[PDB]
Amino acid sequence: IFRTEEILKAAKMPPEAVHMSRLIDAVYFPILIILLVGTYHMHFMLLAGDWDFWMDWKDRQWWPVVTPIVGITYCSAIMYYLWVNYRQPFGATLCVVCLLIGEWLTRYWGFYWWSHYPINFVTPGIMLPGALMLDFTLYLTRNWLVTALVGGGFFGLLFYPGNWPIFGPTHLPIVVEGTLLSMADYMGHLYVRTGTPEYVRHIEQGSLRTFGGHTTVIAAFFSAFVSMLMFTVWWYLGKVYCTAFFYVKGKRGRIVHRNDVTAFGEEGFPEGIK
């Protein structure tokens, strides 16, 4: 219903070759999924996992700025790989889905079932709408620079509105011992973190140069701007990550870079197959 038979006919694959290709896909794609889970999860948690773990770290200054900048990195590289090599537009969504799968597994088994923290206190939460819109921008524009601009803007801007339905109810006010707190703050105080005291929270604190009514908005744009840079940089990193050569040697013992080329991609190879 898509155009798969035409693609297979253009590739000149006999039925056994088609079955072998299907087996290659079924073997390699789960491997890529697991690698994305592991590596992207490590990168995200060790760069932005602290705001990710706890409800009271989700603030208006650092969370919506740090999170998208860290998240765009693997997404840009994987999108480069998929789009450039196979014309597949689901890179960023796949990255964020893998990250969320790993995050949910660790929160349920590590934080909750081992450390006895409640599940609602460790919602990560989502970063998916921005990745989806970035994928849609890359597919519709087909240009990676226009994709950098527009998709990075979307990725940096849609983070806070997309997470507001999850963490908005946690901002309801409570009064404890005559002191006003957000419900996330009282959840953080209620469930003791022996290794995490209050003063380590890198959250907003207000300033005499600060417009309290615009804070998130400013954080929504700065995180966007850097994203437009970061994407671009990591897009070039994708070209570094796709570098596939061999160190061959001969005679004097000299080492030369050698590239294995696809024979089907040559000038007259497809016509001579028949």
Partner 1 sequence: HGERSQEPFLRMRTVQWYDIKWGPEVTKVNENAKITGKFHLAEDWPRAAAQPDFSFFNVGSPSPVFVRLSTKINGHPWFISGPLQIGRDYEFEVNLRARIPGRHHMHAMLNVKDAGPIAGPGAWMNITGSWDDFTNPLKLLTGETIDSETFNLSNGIFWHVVWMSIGIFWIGVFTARPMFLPRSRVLLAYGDDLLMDPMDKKITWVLAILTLALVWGGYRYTENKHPYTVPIQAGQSKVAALPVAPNPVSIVITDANYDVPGRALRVTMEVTNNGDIPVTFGEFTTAGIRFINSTGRKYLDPQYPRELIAVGLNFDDESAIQPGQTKELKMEAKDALWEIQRLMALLGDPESRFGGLLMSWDAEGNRHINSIAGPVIPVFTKL
Query: Shortest gap between Cβ of 103 and partner 1 (angstroms)?
Result: 10
- Least distance (Å) between residue 42 CB and partner 1: 21
Residue 59 is assigned to a ligand binding site: no
CA–CA distance, 2 with 15 (Å, rounded to integer): 19
CA dihedral for 237, 260, 37, 84, sign (positive or negative): positive
Of residues 142 and 249, the one with the C-beta less far from partner 1: 142
Tokens of 101: 């799968």
Calpha distance 74→95 (Å, rounded): 7
CB atoms within 10 A of CB 126: 17
Would the annotation count 185 as a binding residue? yes
Nearer to partner 1, 97 or 237 (CB): 97
Nearer to partner 1, 119 or 240 (CB): 119
Q: How far is the CB of 180 from partner 1 (least distance, A)?
A: 5
Angle at the Cα of 121 from the Cα atoms of 38 and 39, rounded to 5 degrees: 10
DSSP one-letter string for 37-87: HHHHHHHHHHHHHHHHH-GGG--SSSHHHHHHHHHHHHHHHHHHHHHHHH-
CB of 5 to partner 1, least distance (A): 10
Virtual CA dihedral for 224, 78, 137, 43, nearest 10 degrees?
A: -20
Least separation in angstroms between CB 237 and partner 1:
21
d(CA 188, CA 195): 13
**Of 191 and 222, which CB lies nearer to partner 1 in the complex structure?**
191
Residue 189 marked in a binding site = yes
- Which residue's CB is nearer to partner 1, number 109 or number 164? 164
| Feature table: binding site | 185, 189, 202
Which residues participate in the annotated binding site for Cu(+)?
185, 189, 202
